[PDB]
From a paper:
The P. falciparum Bromodomain Protein 1 (PfBDP1) has been shown to interact with acetylated lysine modifications on histone H3 to regulate the expression of invasion-related genes. Recent studies on PfBDP1 have shown that it is a multidomain protein with a predicted ankyrin repeat in the N-terminal region, and a bromodomain (BRD) near the C-terminus. A crystal structure of the PfBDP1 bromodomain (PfBDP1-BRD) reveals it contains the conserved bromodomain fold, but our comparative analysis between the PfBDP1-BRD and human bromodomain families indicates it has a unique binding mechanism.
To structurally characterize the PfBDP1-BRD in complex with the histone H3K14ac ligand, an expression construct containing residues 333–456 was used for the crystallization trials. The structure was solved by molecular replacement with a monomer of the PfBDP1 bromodomain in the asymmetric unit. The end of the αZ helix encodes a ‘HIF’ shelf that forms the bottom of the binding pocket, and the long and variable ZA loop (358–378 aa) frames one side of the binding pocket before connecting to the αA helix. The αB helix is 19 aa shorter than the αC helix and is connected by a 3-residue long BC loop, which contains the conserved asparagine residue N413 that is involved in the coordination of the acetyllysine moiety. Like other bromodomains, the predicted acetyllysine binding pocket of PfBDP1-BRD (333–456) has a conserved asparagine residue (Asn413) responsible for making a hydrogen bond to the acetyllysine, while the gatekeeper residue valine (Val419) and the HIF shelf motif (res 354–356) are important for ligand binding specificity. Thus, the PfBDP1-BRD appears to be a cross between two human bromodomain families by having the ‘wide’ acetyllysine binding pocket observed in the BET bromodomains, combined with the shelf motif from BRPF3, which has a ‘keyhole’ type pocket due to its large Phe gatekeeper residue.
Residue numbers in the entry: 333 to 456
Amino acid sequence: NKQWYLLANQLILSLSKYEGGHIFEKLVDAKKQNCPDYYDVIKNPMSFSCIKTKLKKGQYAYPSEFVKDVQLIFDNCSLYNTSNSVVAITGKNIETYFNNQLIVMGYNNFILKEKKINDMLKLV
């Protein structure tokens, strides 16, 4: 469990410091950012800081869950923001960075190990 938790903490940190990442660090303050419709659109809000809290609190039980929450950030981004907007472009770029970091760091190996383990349990 701890090997993938470490990787996730590094990776959330890599996202926070990546170009444009500050946009996804905190939850949108709908009034303060002039986004008054944001939570009428985004019903599952997520930010890097929420994910850091989940890691801090040991709330992830499987490595895929961390990836699912990060991907939710990017999915909310593309849903709320038009595809030709600066924010949507930034979110696509960070999404590519993240998915490639999953490869370079070998995080996807933990997810595939997750699956085969879950699958053998079923076959017992």
